[PDB]
Swiss-Prot record:
The modification 4-hydroxyproline is found at residues 4, 10, 21. The chain holds residues 46 to 72 of 73 of the full protein. The modification Tyrosine amide is found at residue 27. Omega-conotoxins act at presynaptic membranes, they bind and block voltage-gated calcium channels (Cav). This toxin blocks N-type calcium channels (Cav2.2/CACNA1B) with a high potency (it displaces [125I]GVIA with an IC(50)=3.7-38 pM). It comes from Conus geographus. Disulfide bonds join 1-16, 8-19, 15-26. Changing residue 13 to F: Decrease in affinity. This is Omega-conotoxin GVIA.
Amino acid sequence: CKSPGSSCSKTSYNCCRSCNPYTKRCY
C-alpha cells in the first residue's frame, strides 16, 4: 500500500488504512 498519510485522492485506494479526502492524505 502507501503510508498512513500518503497523499492519496478519491480513486487512490492504495492506503493500508484508508484515504482521507479532507487532507488528500491517508488516515
